[PDB]
Amino acid sequence: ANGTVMSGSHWGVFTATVENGRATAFTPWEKDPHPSPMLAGVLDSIYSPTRIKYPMVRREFLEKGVNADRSTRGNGDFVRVSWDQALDLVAAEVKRVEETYGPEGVFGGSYGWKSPGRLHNCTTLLRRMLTLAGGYVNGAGDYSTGAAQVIMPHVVGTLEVYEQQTAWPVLAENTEVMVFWAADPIKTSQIGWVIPEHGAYPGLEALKAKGTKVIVIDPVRTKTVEFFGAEHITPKPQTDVAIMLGMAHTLVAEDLYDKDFIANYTSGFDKFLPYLDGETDSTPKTAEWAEGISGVPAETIKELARLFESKRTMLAAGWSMQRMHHGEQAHWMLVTLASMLGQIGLPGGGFGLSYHYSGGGTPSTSGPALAGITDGGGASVIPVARVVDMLENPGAEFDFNGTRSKFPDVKMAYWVGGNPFVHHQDRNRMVKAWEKLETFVVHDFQWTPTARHADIVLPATTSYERNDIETIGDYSNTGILAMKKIVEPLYEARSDYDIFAAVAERLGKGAEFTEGKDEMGWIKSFYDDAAKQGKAAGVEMPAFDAFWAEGIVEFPVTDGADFVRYASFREDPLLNPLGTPTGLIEIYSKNIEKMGYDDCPAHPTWMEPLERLDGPGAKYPLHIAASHPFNRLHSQLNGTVLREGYAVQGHEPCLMHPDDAAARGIADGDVVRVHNDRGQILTGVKVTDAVMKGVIQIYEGGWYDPSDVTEPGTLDKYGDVNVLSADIGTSKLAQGNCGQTVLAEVEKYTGPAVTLTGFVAPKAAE
Numbered sequence: 074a075n076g077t078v079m080s081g082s083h084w085g086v087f088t089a090t091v092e093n094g095r096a097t098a099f100t101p102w103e104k105d106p107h108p109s110p111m112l113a114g115v116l117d118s119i120y121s122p123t124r125i126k127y128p129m130v131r132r133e134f135l136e137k138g139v140n141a142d143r144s145t146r147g148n149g150d151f152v153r154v155s156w157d158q159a160l161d162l163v164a165a166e167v168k169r170v171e172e173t174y175g176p177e178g179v180f181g182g183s184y185g186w187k188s189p190g191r192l193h194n195c196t197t198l199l200r201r202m203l204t205l206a207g208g209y210v211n212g213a214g215d216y217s218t219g220a221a222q223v224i225m226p227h228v229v230g231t232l233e234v235y236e237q238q239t240a241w242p243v244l245a246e247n248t249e250v251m252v253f254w255a256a257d258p259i260k261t262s263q264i265g266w267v268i269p270e271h272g273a274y275p276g277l278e279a280l281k282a283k284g285t286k287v288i289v290i291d292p293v294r295t296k297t298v299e300f301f302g303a304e305h306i307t308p309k310p311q312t313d314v315a316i317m318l319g320m321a322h323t324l325v326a327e328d329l330y331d332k333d334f335i336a337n338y339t340s341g342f343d344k345f346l347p348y349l350d351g352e353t354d355s356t357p358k359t360a361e362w363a364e365g366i367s368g369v370p371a372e373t374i375k376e377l378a379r380l381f382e383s384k385r386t387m388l389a390a391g392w393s394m395q396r397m398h399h400g401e402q403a404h405w406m407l408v409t410l411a412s413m414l415g416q417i418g419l420p421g422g423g424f425g426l427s428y429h430y431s432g433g434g435t436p437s438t439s440g441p442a443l444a445g446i447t448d449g450g451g452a453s454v455i456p457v458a459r460v461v462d463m464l465e466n467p468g469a470e471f472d473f474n475g476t477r478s479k480f481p482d483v484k485m486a487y488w489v490g491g492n493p494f495v496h497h498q499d500r501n502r503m504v505k506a507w508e509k510l511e512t513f514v515v516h517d518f519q520w521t522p523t524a525r526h527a528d529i530v531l532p533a534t535t536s537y538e539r540n541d542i543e544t545i546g547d548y549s550n551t552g553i554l555a556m557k558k559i560v561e562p563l564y565e566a567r568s569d570y571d572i573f574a575a576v577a578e579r580l581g582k583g584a585e586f587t588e589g590k591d592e593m594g595w596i597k598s599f600y601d602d603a604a605k606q607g608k609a610a611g612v613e614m615p616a617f618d619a620f621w622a623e624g625i626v627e628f629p630v631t632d633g634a635d636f637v638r639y640a641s642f643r644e645d646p647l648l649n650p651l652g653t654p655t656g657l658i659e660i661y662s663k664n665i666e667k668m669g670y671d672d673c674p675a676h677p678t679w680m681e682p683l684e685r686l687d688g689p690g691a692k693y694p695l696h697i698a699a700s701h702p703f704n705r706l707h708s709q710l711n712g713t714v715l716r717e718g719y720a721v722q723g724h725e726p727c728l729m730h731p732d733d734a735a736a737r738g739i740a741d742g743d744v745v746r747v748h749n750d751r752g753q754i755l756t757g758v759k760v761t762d763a764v765m766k767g768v769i770q771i772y773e774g775g776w777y778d779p780s781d782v783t784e785p786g787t788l789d790k791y792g793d794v795n796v797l798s799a800d801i802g803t804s805k806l807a808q809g810n811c812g813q814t815v816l817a818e819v820e821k822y823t824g825p826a827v828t829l830t831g832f833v834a835p836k837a838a839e
């Protein structure tokens with residue numbers, strides 16, 4: 074092959090140059106307003122040294138099965154086998170666990186970002202196969218908004234976090250003050266769950282062009298601060314709820330708040346006020362009290378409050394601040410403050426929880442929705458971040474949103490499209506708990522830490538080696554794209570669909586899994602359903618072969634540019650109620666009161682977390698801002714040429730303030746040891762005043778590279794920040810992860826020299 078083909082990914086729509094059957098360049102779509110620089114690593118990931126070539130079986134597992142020594146998982150001692158031998162083995166283990174232990178013995182949650190595509194959806198295909206096998210245990214919720222997605226339904230009656238926002242053009246005309254609270258939209262808008270349209274960049278440009286006042290509340294001076302030249306407030310991490318309380322107190326004491334919005338559209342403020350004023354605990358939540366906890370000057374807190382009440386203000390909040398202990402309080406308190414300001418439902422005012430993710434706010438079109446392949450459908454479901462608790466405590470009870478259940482006794486886990494050996498918290502705890510599993514099977518196209526720890530590893534293909542169909546724009550529904558095959562499958566890789574169809578055949582359910590269709594048969598069935606709906610809806614669409622030839626169909630915008638969140642509620646609350654018990658915004662919740670949880674009271678409350686910067690009696694001195702990477706999508710693309718632009722002496726970078734480096738005798742470029750009571754990792758330092766003093770930045774997603782897998786607490790040589798995090802729930806209400814509640818110490822490294830081993834394939838898979 075020679076020529077150009079159009080396809081897409083989590084980073085955008087692109088055109089590939091193909092020279093003699095090798096892809097040589099990926100060029101952005103000409104209609105993409107702001108392409109991501111990561112595209113070059115996407116191309117590289119097809120061919121890099123960590124591409125998985127053949128099916129492999131861990132030697133100890135091949136030789137002894139259930140009696141293998143499970144403490145050597147991760148050491149790289151693999152044996153190459155034929156596909157027929159691998160598929161027979163996988164089918165035999167699925168059958169054995171289902172027959173001996175039941176559906177409760179198989180964990181199939183398989184959390185992960187995978188790749189877009191309606192047919193080649195590896196995690197849905199995994200559940201489709203396991204359902205035909207007898208069943209499995211599944212996961213509930215996600216690692217992004219684990220706390221916020223449970224508390225919003227109790228407060229505003231809807232999910233809220235993954236719903237369309239007041240449109241960007243409406244903000245440009247009406248907003249006077251734009252606040253980015255714990256959000257860095259310049260960094261996080263580069264990717265989409267489905268294909269991204271990068272709709273936030275023109276939206277942010279328009280705010281800057283109109284001269285709107287922008288305020289950023291974040292411990293790091295990010296690209297969003299720089300882009301706008303914004304006013305920047307730097308709180309100590311995990312203290313945002315205290316600042317919010319101090320603002321609320323100020324509005325009450327100066328008699329500025331909207332008493333009519335409070336009286337007519339909310340419920341429970343009378344129960345919250347005594348707490349705010351200090352009647353219940355002798356502690357008035359003043360701006361001065363708030364300064365003592367957060368470090369932000371009391372006069373600044375009062376001035377911000379006054380400004381927000383007197384101008385049309387939009388509170389745009391990100392999700393880092395609820396990915397922490399007691400994380401439910403942050404967005405519950407933000408909605409309470411927004412109710413006191415009284416602008417919810419007005420054009421350009423109120424709050425928004427998705428302006429930093431997947432285009433939220435880009436005007437929606439009138440096109441039809443596209444559907445894909447389905448899954449065919451102790452506890453049968455657990456909160457996703459309780460996976461290690463589950464393995465350590467089979468049969469024990471756990472609390473979750475008002476209900477009590479028991480953990481299932483799992484013996485096998487099957488993971489595709491995810492990297493738990495990078496994404497889950499407390500790596501050393503996790504490594505020890507994984508010994509409880511008899512069998513661990515993984516599919517991926519790259520040799521991640523998760524692939525290196527499996528018993529059986531099967532090489533998948535990338536999206537660039539097959540055909541598929543997907544929507545452009547999670548919220549905008551801009552159009553539908555043909556994700557055309559670019560190169561033939563490499564080495565001995567197969568799509569997840571083909572792997573699962575062959576396992577299903579072996580369990581005698583081959584026809585139920587494929588439904589008699591092939592790749593193009595399935596894709597046309599999804600496209601005809603969307604074209605039929607479109608017709609009902611008056612939206613014209615071509616026939617499938619003609620759509621495939623063009624490669625894309627775009628839809629028209631009708632009234633999408635005028636959408637204003639909460640306008641009909643504001644217009645008449647009795648006629649357009651919220652989904653809560655009272656029909657109003659619940660500041661005090663009687664349902665949460667009845668649950669009786671000590672770590673989630675019935676109104677927003679300041680509570681001390683497990684550990685925080687400058688907390689009374691804190692052991693470690695620095696907070697780690699363990700946030701999302703600028704030049705990776707989580708762990709994706711770490712094993713590519715992009716690593717060279719950011720690694721420091723080959724390690725993952727650590728940003729540190731000049732005063733904190735000087736006290737430790739550390740210089741820019743030094744290799745350092747970052748440690749606490751849970752673990753120890755190596756990173757390379759970059760000295761900068763971009764991080765506030767007392768905070769260090771190490772992004773999540775680095776590929777864990779242990780020195781010796783049989784040594785408890787072994788040093789990670791590359792820089793996986795989850796070796797340092799604690800694995801606990803946000804509270805009994807949501808049970809979300811706390812991946813950003815982390816303190817540690819840093820010292821110059823003085824041990825033996827080290828050789829990095831995570832970016833080349835295991836010797837036997839070469």
Ligand SMILES: NC1=NC(=O)C2=N[C@H]3C(S)=C(S)[C@@H](COP(=O)(O)OP(=O)(O)OC[C@H]4O[C@@H](n5cnc6c(=O)[nH]c(N)nc65)[C@H](O)[C@@H]4O)O[C@H]3NC2=N1
Pocket residue numbers: 216217218254255256257260261262263264290291292293295308309310311312313390391392393394396429430698699700701702703704705706707813
């Ligand atoms: N380039 C890129 N890479 C990705 O991996 C990526 N992941 C996607 C995913 S799945 C999601 S879930 C979203 C995540 O979007 P999310 O809002 O959770 O992003 P983070 O990078 O964890 O945090 C954003 C900001 O919060 C600041 N921050 C941290 N702690 C605090 C605090 O206590 N208080 C305050 N006020 N600020 C704090 C950080 O410094 C950071 O600038 O991004 C998505 N987009 C992504 N883009």
Ligand SMILES: NC1=NC(=O)C2=N[C@H]3C(S)=C(S)[C@@H](COP(=O)(O)OP(=O)(O)OC[C@H]4O[C@@H](n5cnc6c(=O)[nH]c(N)nc65)[C@H](O)[C@@H]4O)O[C@H]3NC2=N1
Pocket residue numbers: 184185186187188193195216217218396489490491492493495496497516517518519521533534535536569699700701706707708709773774794795798812813
């Ligand atoms: N400390 C900390 N702070 C955080 O802010 C934080 N963020 C959390 C969040 S919000 C999330 S969403 C998780 C992300 O954790 P997640 O496991 O989703 O991360 P990825 O690096 O996207 O792993 C995706 C894997 O799927 C593989 N893959 C892609 N396409 C295919 C395919 O078609 N077939 C197969 N078989 N494999 C494929 C990729 O190669 C990659 O290895 O991290 C969480 N972890 C976090 N920890």
